[PDB]
RNA sequence: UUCAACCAUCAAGCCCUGGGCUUGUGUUGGGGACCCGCGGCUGCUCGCGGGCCCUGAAAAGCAGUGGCGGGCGUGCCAGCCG
């Protein structure tokens, strides 16, 4: 637990940081 | 005012049977169905609301 | 056939002297492949995840609802890996994902995401923590009913 | 069990058909056409169903000949979503009358196996043979109404029935409304 | 009856949530012996 | 036994009285039904109340059709308890809500010929409307003359 | 196996793949030809063209009968059109070679007797009316016979046209056929006495007269100027009945 | 309708607007429309007409550089976009902020929030007459509840089967398109509704009273001549007002009846 | 047990050679301030129509007016008009 409304709903995630295997190009 | 008589398709079929290229058979309007039993699916049995 | 046609158009464009991006547009496709989908979920690029209910072995997808819950991704369990394979032009698919769609379908994607949330995840919020199985056989249930009736009568 | 999406779709179809019929009635405003009854929406409004019953197009794959007047053009415009209509040529008319030609005597359907039937039923109008019938239908003579009322509606076949993977598929897909002009003849060739 | 009304409601809910293909054909077997099917050779 | 009242909302366009009755008659017998509509237009306000004869039938139908995605609308189906169901909830239920052209009534009412006594009342209330607008224009800094309105 | 693949593609929703696989099926409803090719079977069954000419009686009777039938699943409409095409090509060969000898009008139909390479060929053609398909016949095995006989008649027509030095298949006009040319839609082109009995006459056929047998007989026995009523179709020498060049008129009205 | 009374009405209204805005002041004075109000004895139209009528002005409106213009054309949008980028003058190229055809409009702006975003993103909407009958369903009540930003009809079809948009556009010449676009942008708009009232935007507060008087005179002349049924014996009242000011009368009628056929004892 | 598209992507008519004019009726529901025009209401106010904002295709009684026919005087019309 811790533009458009369609954009907000599609892009809404949680506050946990992303996990990356490696640094990706670009 | 000519009245054409007979059936030429029947004549050709009779000619085939008489000359012996094929034997005379009768039409089967209904064939026997496979003997089966109706039962309800497991998901529809286990559906609960 | 579509890929061969696109490659022919791009080869024509290169031969006449423009980049392939001048003739080809940015694609929008269903993302699939288990490792690819898990990577997208970890990078938080997936907007919606659909996981097949009959993956054997189950260990390939048993962590996926917990991963989606941690990453904040909406997920739904759906019947048919063959049904997902019909989407991805394969025999079977273990999991599919949407990261982004076109502007004429972004509203439909948002409506589907909200519908999946309110009508699936809120309903399975409590039942996902319960133990399954434990169902008795027919004759065992009849014997249990008979002995409970005998105990109640006596 | 009938689903709510089917209910909403039927309501929207009925409202759209009501709007279209009202627009036709507000706007208001001699060739030969062949009309084939195809599959449309399930619920038909009373005026289109009355026109279909008058034109004897109640069953699917039924074909009739219509003389184009102002009135018949209005009825055709009314029942456009359920029919496919066009201009039949001489080969189409001749093949339809010779191969699938049935006449109506006393309410019964009798195939046109001989010219004496045509002479007995339409001989008072000068039509004494099946070729006289074809001439009247194709040229749209003074006795076109009598000839078309003598002719039974044509029961056309489904070419998709001969192939098992496409056995349930209807031959004519709805959506291409309006006059097909000379392109009804391909459908006549395939279905006759 | 109340049981009939409840059964009608359950049937309607089942049709709404799952569909109408609730039943399946199974073969009637007069014998308890299973044989290998005859295939193309 | 106990009546069951279900409130349904997020109605898509076309999911109206007859459609609702036909769809939920599959679930159970409906005694009353009313879609909330605007009296100035006749358009639906995307909500309705259905009163089934059986409370458990209503409850099953509400749990079945709650959060149902229909034509882009996620339906909201809830069971109202008998405590706060309004006694005057189903007035005008089970009958057609007629659409009335109030604008056409007003236009043809002003187009209707009418009599000289109410013409004098008409024109008179028009001059004190003129006088009210004139005394509003006094502090406006504006002066408008008015022609002498003739009477028949 | 191909039908199973088409069913799999349709079940998976690959409509383009299903259409591409259905193109390999060679369906009679699309091609007008039999589903399977019987070219080797023709050579196996008829060792000699004389044997083919001797079986042309049954072949021609079957094909002239089936050229006037409604479309069915066993014999589709394009297949019926191909039967009519082959019959018209054979009639054009008989006309150009003057091989027609005798004709008869029985109560059953029109009998024709020709002489091709010393073989007497007699066959029966129904009157142009509605032919009744009754349940006492096996229509599907009749359709198999029709497929075999059209495969035979194509090769027979090719050999006859090549023997008389003409291009096979003849040029065919779709527009004229749509207007109703029938026999008149064929243009016979070069490759790379009872015959002149109606040579000097001009005939006009009224619409109540049998146009196809009358045209076939007159053109086979030497008439080069046959006009008819306008509704009988395109290809008449003249259309108006008031043409002074007309010598004979065929009528059947009281 | 005497023009001196109209001129002193514009003078009084502008003085009122400035003294009200004094109590940024010039920004508040700017973007303040002037509305001419027509009151008629009967309904001007028997039904709602959703296509505005154009009245040509000696002093055209929307001449500011910040006005964004959205142009809706028939398919394809690529030809019209190329005409925008290549063969239009610079002022119209800067003014036109978006070109979108009817198919893309129906694809992308079916949602009400998308319609409201498109409504907010532009000020003047122009629409080809070939597709303007389909725009009420495509844009909804978002564009047609308020008559301010209704699509103005423009003629782009070249004056004389199914047309394929890729092979042909069926368009009139580009200078004619330029002239039509400029004329429709500058033209005042009249909206026909089943009402006794009609409001027309004739100018802004920063304009000159002579310009307002001339614009009011020409729109009164053309609108009574063309759009008012039964000419001058249907016109009841004329007013000039602002968004918050009162209504200053211009011409008030003497006969309050429609004609003598309403007279019955 | 199919939630797709499907109006006019221009036609018809006027001036009679200028490229212009007319018709082709097609809008989700709510909420907040507030300037007005016109009907009633003794009047407040209630109606019709505009002006300014807000909104996921959002929603929790307040339903209101005279009739032709049809169904059995009518909280009935998948029929209409006033």
DSSP per residue, D34-88 = EEEE----SS--HHHHHHHHHTT--STTEEEEEE--HHHHHHHHHTGGGEEEE--
Contact F64 E12 (CB under 8 A): yes
H or E segment and range at residue F5: strand F4-9
Tokens of B7: 């059936």
Which of H43, H252, H258 faces F146 most closely, judged by CB atoms?
H252
Q: What is the dihedral of CA H147, H151, H153, H157, to 10 degrees?
A: -170
Cα separation, C35 vs C43, whole angstroms? 12
| Residue linked to tokens 């042909």 | H168
Cα separation, G216 vs G107, whole angstroms? 20
Coil/strand/helix, residue G249: strand
Cα separation, H252 vs H238, whole angstroms? 6
Contact E27 B49 (CB under 8 A): no
Burial class (CB in 10 A: 0-12, 13-18, 19+), B48: exposed
Cα separation, D132 vs D151, whole angstroms? 13
Q: In this structure, are residues D13 and D48 in contact, taking their beta carbons and an 8 Å threshold? A: no
Burial class (CB in 10 A: 0-12, 13-18, 19+), G212: middle
Omega cis (within 30) before C57: yes
- For residue F32, say whether its CB is under 7 Å from any atom of strand I: no
Enter the resolution in angstroms: 2.5
Burial class (CB in 10 A: 0-12, 13-18, 19+), H81: middle
Burial class (CB in 10 A: 0-12, 13-18, 19+), G192: exposed
In whole angstroms, I69 C1' to D16 CA is 25
Q: In this structure, are residues G170 and B45 in contact, taking their beta carbons and an 8 Å threshold? A: no
Neighbours of chain H (3+ CB pairs under 8 A): A, C, F
Name the pairing type of β-strands F30-37 and H69-73.
Answer: unpaired
Cα separation, F49 vs G85, whole angstroms? 70
Cα separation, H247 vs H12, whole angstroms? 11
Angle among Cα D18, D23, D27 to the nearest 5 degrees reads 150
Structure-determination approach? cryo-EM
In whole angstroms, I14 C1' to G224 CA is 59
Nearest alpha-carbon partner for F65 in F80, F55, F76? F76
In whole angstroms, I10 C1' to H131 CA is 9
Strand partners for G110: G105, G125
Tokens of F51: 């009163």
Contact E18 B37 (CB under 8 A): no
Inter-chain Cβ pairs, chain B and chain D, closer than 8 A: 9
Q: Which residues of D touch G73 (CB under 8 A)?
A: 161-162
Cα separation, H56 vs H61, whole angstroms? 10
- For residue H51, say whether its CB is under 7 Å from any atom of strand I: yes
H or E segment and range at residue D84: strand D83-86
Q: In this structure, are residues H173 and H198 in contact, taking their beta carbons and an 8 Å threshold? A: no
| Residue linked to tokens 């002149």 | G196
- Nucleotides on chain I that have an atom closer than 7 A to a protein CB are 1-11, 19-22, 24-30, 34-41, 43, 47-52, 54-67, 75-82
Q: In this structure, are residues G22 and G14 in contact, taking their beta carbons and an 8 Å threshold? A: no
Nucleotide with the nearest C1' to F7 CA: I60
Cα separation, H130 vs G197, whole angstroms? 69
Tokens of G220: 């086979």
Nearest alpha-carbon partner for H50 in H138, H168, H162? H138
Which of C70, C106, C114 faces A16 most closely, judged by CB atoms?
C70
Coil/strand/helix, residue C79: coil
Q: In this structure, are residues F77 and F61 in contact, taking their beta carbons and an 8 Å threshold? A: yes
Q: In this structure, are residues F118 and F144 in contact, taking their beta carbons and an 8 Å threshold? A: no
Omega cis (within 30) before H76: yes
Shortest CA gap C59–chain A (Å):
21
- For residue H199, say whether its CB is under 7 Å from any atom of strand I: yes
Cα separation, D157 vs D135, whole angstroms? 25
Residues in chain H: 265
Coil/strand/helix, residue G110: strand
Tokens of C131: 């133990």
With an 8 Å Cβ cutoff, is G126 touching chain B? yes
Neighbours of chain B (3+ CB pairs under 8 A): D, E, F, G
In whole angstroms, I20 C1' to H28 CA is 40
Tokens of G129: 């009316």
Q: Helices D184-191 & D90-99, crossing angle to 10 degrees? A: 30
H or E segment and range at residue F79: strand F76-80
How many helices (DSSP H) and strands (DSSP E) are in chain B?
A: 2, 1
Tokens of D117: 């039937």
Extended strands (E) in chain H: 33-40, 53-55, 69-73, 96-101, 124-128, 152-154, 188-190, 197-204, 235-241, 248-252
Burial class (CB in 10 A: 0-12, 13-18, 19+), H224: middle
Cα separation, F32 vs F92, whole angstroms? 10
Cα separations (Å) of F2 from B14, C128, E3, F83, H199?
Answer: 77, 34, 15, 12, 57
């Amino acid at each position: 637990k811790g533009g458009l409304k369609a954009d907000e709903i599609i892009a809404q995630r949680s506050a946990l940081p992303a996990v990356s295997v490696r640094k990706r190009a670009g | 005012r000519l009245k054409p008589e007979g059936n030429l398709l029947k004549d050709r079929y009779r000619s085939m049977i008489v000359r012996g290229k094929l034997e005379a058979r009768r039409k089967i309007p209904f064939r026997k169905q496979a003997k089966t039993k109706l039962t309800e699916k497991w998901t529809f049995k286990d559906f609960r609301i | 056939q579509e890929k061969k046609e696109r490659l022919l158009r791009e080869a024509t464009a290169i031969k006449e002297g423009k980049k392939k991006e001048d003739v080809s547009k940015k694609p929008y496709t269903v993302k699939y492949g288990l490792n690819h989908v898990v990577g997208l979920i970890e990078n938080k690029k997936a907007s919606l995840v659909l996981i097949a209910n009959d993956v054997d072995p189950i260990e390939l997808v048993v962590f996926l609802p917990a991963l989606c819950r941690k990453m904040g991704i909406p997920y739904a369990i759906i019947k048919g890996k063959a049904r997902l394979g019909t989407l991805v032009h394969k025999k079977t698919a273990a999991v599919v994902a949407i990261t982004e769609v076109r502007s004429e379908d972004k509203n439909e994607l948002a409506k589907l995401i909200s519908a999946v949330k309110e009508g699936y995840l809120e309903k399975v919020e409590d039942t996902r923590k319960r133990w399954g199985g434990g169902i008795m056989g027919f004759k065992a249930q009849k014997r249990e009913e008979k002995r409970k009736k005998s105990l109640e009568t006596a | 069990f009938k689903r709510a999406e089917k209910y909403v779709k039927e309501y929207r179809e009925q409202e759209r058909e009501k709007i279209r019929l009202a627009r036709i009635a507000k706007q208001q405003g001699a060739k030969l056409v062949f009309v084939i009854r195809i599959k449309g929406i399930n619920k038909i409004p009373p005026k289109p169903r009355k026109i279909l019953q008058l034109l004897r197009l109640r069953q699917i794959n039924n074909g009739v000949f219509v003389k184009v007047t102002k009135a018949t053009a209005e009825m055709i415009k009314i029942v456009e979503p359920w029919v496919a209509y066009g201009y039949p040529n001489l080969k189409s008319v001749r093949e339809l009358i010779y191969k699938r030609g049935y006449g109506k005597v006393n309410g019964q359907r009798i195939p046109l196996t001989d010219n004496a039937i045509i002479e007995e039923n339409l001989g008072k109008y000068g039509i004494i043979c099946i070729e006289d019938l074809i001439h009247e239908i194709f040229t749209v003579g003074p006795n076109f109404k009598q000839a078309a009322n003598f002719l039974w509606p044509f029961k056309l076949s489904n070419p998709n029935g001969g192939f098992r993977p496409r056995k349930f598929k209807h031959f004519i897909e709805g959506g291409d409304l309006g006059n097909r002009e000379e392109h009804i003849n391909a459908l006549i060739r395939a279905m006759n | 009856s109340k049981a009939a009304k409840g059964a009608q409601a359950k049937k309607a809910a089942q049709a709404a949530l799952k569909g109408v293909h609730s039943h399946k054909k199974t073969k009637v077997r007069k014998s308890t012996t299973f044989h290998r099917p005859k295939t193309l050779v | 036994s106990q009546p069951g009242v279900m409130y349904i909302a997020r109605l898509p366009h076309g999911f109206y009285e007859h459609e609702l009755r036909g769809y939920f008659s599959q679930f159970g017998e409906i005694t009353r039904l009313r879609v909330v509509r605007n009296k100035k237009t006749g358009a639906s306000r995307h909500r309705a109340f259905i009163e089934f004869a059986d409370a458990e039938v209503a409850d099953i139908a509400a749990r079945t059709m709650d959060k149902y995605l229909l034509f882009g609308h996620i339906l909201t189906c809830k069971i109202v308890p008998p405590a706060q169901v309004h006694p005057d909830l189903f007035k005008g239920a089970n009958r057609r809500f007629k659409v009335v052209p109030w604008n056409k009534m007003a236009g043809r009412q002003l187009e209707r010929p009418l009599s000289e006594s109410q013409w004098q009342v008409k024109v008179a209330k028009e001059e004190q409307r003129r006088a009210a607008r004139a005394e509003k224009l006094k502090e406006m800094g504006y002066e408008f003359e008015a022609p002498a309105l003739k009477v028949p | 196996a191909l039908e199973k693949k088409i069913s799999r593609a349709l079940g998976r929703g690959d409509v383009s793949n299903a259409a591409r696989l259905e193109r390999n099926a060679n369906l009679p409803e699309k091609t007008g030809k039999p589903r399977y090719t019987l070219n080797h079977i023709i050579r196996e069954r008829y060792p000699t063209f004389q044997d083919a000419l001797r079986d042309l009686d049954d072949c021609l009777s079957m094909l002239f009968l089936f050229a006037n039938l409604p479309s069915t699943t066993a014999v589709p409409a394009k297949m019926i059109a191909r039967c009519e095409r082959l019959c018209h090509e054979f009639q054009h060969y008989l006309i150009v070679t003057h091989s027609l000898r005798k004709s008869f009008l029985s109560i059953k139909g029109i009998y024709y007797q020709a002489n091709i390479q010393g073989e007497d060929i007699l066959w029966l053609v129904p009157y142009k009316f509605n032919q009744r398909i009754v349940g006492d016949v096996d229509f599907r095995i009749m359709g198999t016979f029709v497929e075999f006989y059209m495969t035979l008649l194509g090769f027979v027509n090719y050999r006859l046209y090549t023997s008389i030095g003409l291009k096979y298949p003849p040029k065919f006009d779709q527009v004229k056929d749509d207007q109703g040319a029938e026999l008149a839609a064929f243009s016979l082109e070069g490759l790379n006495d009872p015959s002149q009995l109606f040579a000097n006459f001009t005939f006009f056929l009224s619409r109540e007269t049998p146009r196809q047998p009358l045209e076939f007989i007159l053109r086979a026995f030497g008439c080069k100027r046959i006009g008819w009523d306008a509704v009988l179709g395109e290809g008449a020498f003249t259309t108006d009945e008031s043409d002074p060049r007309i010598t004979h008129q065929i009528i059947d009205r009281p | 309708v005497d023009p001196d009374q109209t001129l002193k009405a514009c003078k009084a209204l502008l003085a009122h607007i400035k003294k009200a805005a004094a109590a940024d002041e010039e920004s508040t004075v700017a973007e303040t429309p002037i509305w001419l109000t027509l009151t008629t004895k009967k309904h001007i139209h028997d039904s709602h007409r959703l296509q505005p009528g154009k009245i040509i002005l000696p002093h055209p409106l929307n001449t500011s550089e910040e006005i964004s213009v959205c142009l809706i054309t028939a398919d394809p949008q690529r030809f019209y976009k190329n005409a925008v980028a290549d063969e239009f003058p610079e002022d119209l190229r800067a003014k036109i902020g978006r070109v979108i055809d009817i198919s893309h409009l129906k694809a992308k702006f079916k949602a009400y929030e998308a319609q409201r975003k498109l409504f907010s993103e532009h000020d003047v909407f122009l629409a080809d007459t070939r597709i303007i009958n389909r725009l009420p369903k495509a844009l909804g009540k978002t564009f047609y509840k308020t008559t301010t930003k209704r699509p103005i009809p423009v003629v782009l079809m070249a004056q004389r089967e199914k047309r394929d948009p890729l092979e042909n556009a069926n368009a009139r010449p580009i200078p004619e398109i330029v002239a039509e676009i400029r004329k429709a942008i500058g033209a005042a708009l009249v909206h026909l509704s089943p009402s006794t009232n009609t409001a027309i935007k004739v100018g802004y507060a920063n304009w000159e009273p002579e310009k307002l008087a001339a614009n009011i005179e020409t729109v009164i002349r053309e609108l009574v001549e063309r759009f008012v049924p039964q000419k001058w014996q249907n016109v009841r009242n004329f007013y000039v007002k602002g968004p918050e000011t009162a209504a200053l009368p211009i011409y008030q009628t003497d006969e309050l009846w429609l004609d003598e056929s309403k007279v019955v004892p």
